[PDB]
A paper describes a structure:
This additional density was also observed as a weak signal in the 2D class averages. Although the identity of the extra density could not be definitively determined due to insufficient resolution, based on parallels to Abo1 and the general size and shape of the density, one possibility is that it corresponds to an [name] bromodomain. A notable feature common to all classes of the [name]-H3/[name] complex was the presence of an extra globular density that was unobserved in the [name] alone structure. This density was situated on the top surface of the [name]+ ring close to the central pore and connected to a density resembling the substrate peptide observed in the [name] structure. Superimposing the [name]+ domains from [name] and [name]-histone complexes revealed that in the [name]-histone complexes, the P1 and P6 subunits moved away from each other, thus widening the seam cleft, and opening the [name]+ ring. The changes were most prominent in the asymmetric Class II conformation with less prominent changes in Class III and I. Consistent with potential movement of the N-terminal LD upon H3/H4 binding, examination of [name] intramolecular crosslinks showed that the N-terminal LD crosslinked extensively with the nucleotide binding pocket, pore loop 1, bromodomain, and C-terminal linker (CTL) domain in the absence of histone H3/H4, but lost most of these crosslinks upon histone H3/H4 binding. Together, these data support the idea that H3/H4 binding to the bromo- and CTL domain might allosterically release the N-terminal LD from the P1/P6 seam, open up the [name]+ ring, and prime the [name]+ ring for activation.
[name] is a non-canonical ATP-dependent histone chaperone and a major cancer target. From a structural standpoint, [name] exhibits a conserved multidomain architecture comprising an N-terminal acidic domain, two [name]+ ATPase domains, a bromodomain, C-terminal domain, and an exceptionally long C-terminal linker (CTL) that bridges the bromo- and C-terminal domain. Unlike most other histone chaperones that do not require ATP for activity, [name] stands out due to the presence of an ATP-dependent [name]+ ATPase domain.
Residue numbers in the entry:
A (entry chain B): 422 to 729, 786 to 946, 1330 to 1389
B (entry chain C): 421 to 727, 786 to 945, 1330 to 1390
Write the structure that this text describes.
């Protein structure tokens, strides 16, 4: 029994939808003033779990509380199929007759994509017949009354082109994944009636830590946490096999319960394809934070839409270049992509183009470019262009070059790429796409002495000098930081692991100085060049 | 239920040629028997979706139903005759025909006939073949059905059994194309007739040219969304209440900004699944290339006279220019958009390969055949100097052979753009253009006047907003310094200029951004 209250972050859509069916049943004077006859059709589409069905259910539950009373008809995917020849096209006719009898009413076709495909001469005739009769019913010789048709779909492009037209489906609503803000309202709604209400700061600090959670993940995590407290409180519940009596007044939920559930589950989005966004690990942050900030500020210079009448830009493009082993295409670009949320990102790389065996790669590229254009602004991600170029046939190169050229000049679509060879060493065809004079090239340099000092600061001496459950180590830190003053990233974290290995080697030694000499031997025995 | 040959607009030839079939034999019956004519009694409407077909049927039925001469009317859906029992699938058609004959004259209407009579084939069931057979043998066989007229409608004409399409069964076919400039104005006149504050005709005429690619139901939906937007602008407090309020029906007038918002929010029905290869100049870039567009149009008028009947012989043209001059991205789409009422067929890399499950040769043959069917038309091949190298010899031979078989005097234009000069283009391309005839156009950079007109609007008026001699100095310096830049450099400079105006929005005092504009002027250097 939800009535326009469990929804979160969707204000414009509900306003349009209540303009959609409620106004003619409430204010039948403005419409007759100019003979408007407002529209009677909608179409929902988007990634799963965004609240596609909850909106319809809330509408049906709310509007049934008349006056004015509103009926409802719900249908599954392909209920209108039978073995004989003359029933499938008759179920729709009798359904329309019944709905017209009790007008006004609402007819909701659930997942029309499995009912009305694109017309073709290759498949069976039954699909053509049913799509034809459905097409005739919506707008025939006689006009239908006060019926409203609603449809949902996961693949918008698979619908017959003759259905999308003023008269049948004249409005298309895009349901996207929730942004940073809406998660707060979702958490508030799902955790409303709790006696120990969590503070708004608690909810917000949970909010920035959940990226890629889509509607149902939030509901799942709220229920996967209240069970951790139950399991912790009364461990001896599984042993028995009979009814027990409990004490439900001291099982209040704590903050520490949320962390375990968060580490245990994964979002629905990052379940079938890896998401091309990862925040820096807690170990690498005090080594690359400043560089990442510099990259984003340069992007802000070149991409005005990254601020936080409209800004105007002209073909935003950026490229990151640096020596191999600098971690540019492995740690920097994912962090940059993750920092810029609320922007849909599409991946174009070797694993994806050849990762499907049913379609040509150029078809995939055209589809990706079209989808990027449709929902601008967006970021097109393509890593390691210096190897990416000399792998595909000339046809794909020409198609990619032309498709990008046809985008409107002021359309804010970003092109992000990374390379290992220097700019002058790249092939020319790449070269006349980056205009460094304009400020489209960013170079990478190794971190300074203070950053490297902070990198090893925590290990020595806080973890090594940690009691099992102090001056020579300064010289060890000095010699380590002076020795590693010309190391790339990979060598830097490689050296970090080997020391932690001998750190973990000595769990139960309460007497020190039995491994400090081992430490100073290991740091000098190790040699990389 | 109150439409009678008046709510229809823009269709005159079809309605004129239609009433001569179901009215003339009854109104003037003393002429046909002199020549024993038995005039044709078959029609089949077809066209792109949303062009207003069923409205014609509704108007005809409503007009003929009420009048001095009474004629019956029967209606059918797509495949509403099929029944589970074997003996009832085809018997319903016989009963319907008998009833129609018993009450002659009468009218039989099939809606979406393509869902009832597919082409006969051996790779499907038998009931469809049986229905097709009895239909084609029952309409005109050994009995001379007499005065019965059959009308069908569909969107896919090529999916009809050819045995049904020959005189005797389906006599005439009518083409329902998208409305042009004048028809859109007429349908606007039709759809806004009963408004108390009657809009001026000069407003509708101006608005008509803005709605390119629209057709029928799109116009009808716009005319309603406009009123909804007006109600939105007038009483924005209506959505935060679950109770009826008190409304005053005196301040609900319509303004132009409402139509602007509605047009911005909406997109046409035709180019929804794909994109048409035609776009007009944006307002920002417009005051730079109208002279070039007009010169190009004059060149076409010299070569293509369709812009006594005019005569032409294989019209061709080729726009060439240096890279960065903006000929393959700003000029050709403008020409295509300006020359409307000619159906377009694009042909380039993203279309030849972008769709799989077919061969390029099939696509190119189909495009040319279709363009020949709907002559006159336009064939567009952009970026020829690269398009000529990413195709195999087979496609080259097929294309070079196809355009030689078309009739010589048919008006089939071929349009293409090039970047390298015509001298450097390879062989077999230089012989397709006969520039001695005047088949080659050369572009050149815009001069000082339009350059100044481009920047004066931004740097004189927009630069000084309520929320001054040095402005002339900045304008003249900017114009002087950029007298050798191409289109891309000009738009980049425009954007980098506008960035400062954006970023200094909330400062009430000027002279803080004029300096910033200066350093932007000297610090910004192009590559050239
Ligand atoms: N704003 C929201 N508030 C509460 N629950 C939401 C919200 N958005 C999505 N949901 C969750 O999604 C469900 C309703 O939509 P649901 O996710 O079942 O449809 P969908 O998966 O998007 O569409 P389909 O299942 O057809 O692909 C509810 O069970 C609810 O937990
Ligand atoms: N020239 C016109 N004059 C008036 N109304 C028009 C015109 N063209 C289109 N329309 C409007 O557009 C609608 C088109 O409906 P109709 O079913 O007749 O077209 P259709 O192409 O047969 O539809 P579909 O393709 O969906 O079967 C009509 O209801 C009509 O009001």
């Amino acid at each position: 029994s939800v009535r326009f209250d469990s929804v979160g972050g969707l204000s414009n859509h509900i306003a349009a939808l209540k303009e959609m069916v409620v106004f003619p049943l409430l204010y039948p004077e403005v419409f007759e003033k100019f003979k408007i006859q407002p529209p009677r059709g909608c179409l929902f589409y988007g990634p799963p779990g965004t609240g596609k069905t909850l909106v319809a259910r809330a509408l049906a539950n709310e509007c049934s509380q008349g006056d004015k009373r509103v009926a409802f008809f719900m249908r599954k995917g392909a209920d209108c199929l039978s073995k004989w020849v003359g029933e499938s096209e008759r179920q729709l006719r009798l359904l329309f007759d019944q709905a017209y009898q009790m007008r006004p009413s609402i007819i909701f076709f659930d997942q029309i994509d499995g009912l009305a495909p694109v017309r073709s001469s290759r498949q069976d005739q039954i699909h053509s017949s049913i799509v034809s009769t459905l097409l005739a019913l919506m707008d025939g010789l006689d006009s239908r009354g006060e019926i409203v048709v609603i449809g949902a779909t996961n693949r918008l492009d698979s619908i017959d082109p003759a259905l999308r037209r003023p008269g049948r489906f004249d409005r298309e609503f895009l349901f996207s994944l929730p942004d940073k803000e809406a998660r707060k309202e979702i958490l508030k709604i799902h955790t409303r009636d709790w006696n120990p209400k969590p503070l708004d700061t608690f909810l917000e600090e949970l909010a920035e830590n959940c990226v890629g959670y889509c509607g149902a993940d939030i509901k799942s995590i709220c229920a996967e946490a209240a069970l951790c407290a139950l399991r912790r409180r009364y461990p001896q519940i599984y042993t028995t096999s009979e009814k027990l009596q409990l004490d439900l007044s001291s099982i209040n939920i704590s903050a520490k319960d949320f962390e375990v559930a968060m580490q245990k589950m994964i979002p629905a989005s990052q379940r079938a394809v890896t998401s091309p966004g990862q925040a820096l690990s807690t170990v690498v942050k005090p080594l690359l934070q400043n560089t990442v900030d510099k990259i984003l500020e340069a992007l802000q210079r070149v991409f005005p839409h990254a601020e936080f009448y409209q800004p105007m830009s002209f073909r935003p493009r950026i490229l990151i270049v640096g020596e191999p082993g600098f971690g540019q295409g492995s740690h920097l670009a994912p962090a940059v992509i993750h920092a810029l949320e609320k922007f849909t990102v599409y991946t174009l790389d070797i694993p994806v183009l050849f990762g499907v065996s049913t379609t040509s790669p150029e078809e995939t590229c055209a589809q990706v470019i079209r989808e990027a254009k449709r929902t601008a602004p967006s970021i097109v991600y393509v890593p390691h262009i210096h190897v990416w170029w000399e792998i595909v046939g000339p046809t794909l190169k020409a198609t990619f070059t032309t498709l990008l050229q046809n985008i409107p000049s002021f359309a804010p679509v970003l092109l992000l790429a990374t390379s290992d060879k220097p700019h002058s060493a790249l092939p020319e065809e790449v070269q006349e796409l980056f205009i460094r004079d304009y400020g489209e090239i960013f170079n990478v340099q190794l971190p300074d002495k203070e950053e490297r000092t902070k990198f090893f600061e925590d290990l020595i001496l806080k973890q090594a000098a940690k009691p099992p459950i102090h001056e020579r180590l300064k010289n060890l830190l000095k010699t380590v930081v002076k020795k590693s003053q010309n190391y790339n990233i990979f060598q830097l974290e490689n050296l970090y692991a080997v020391i932690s290995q001998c750190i973990y080697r000595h769990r139960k030694d309460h007497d020190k100085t039995s491994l400090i000499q081992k430490m100073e031997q290991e740091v000098e025995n190790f040699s990389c060049s």
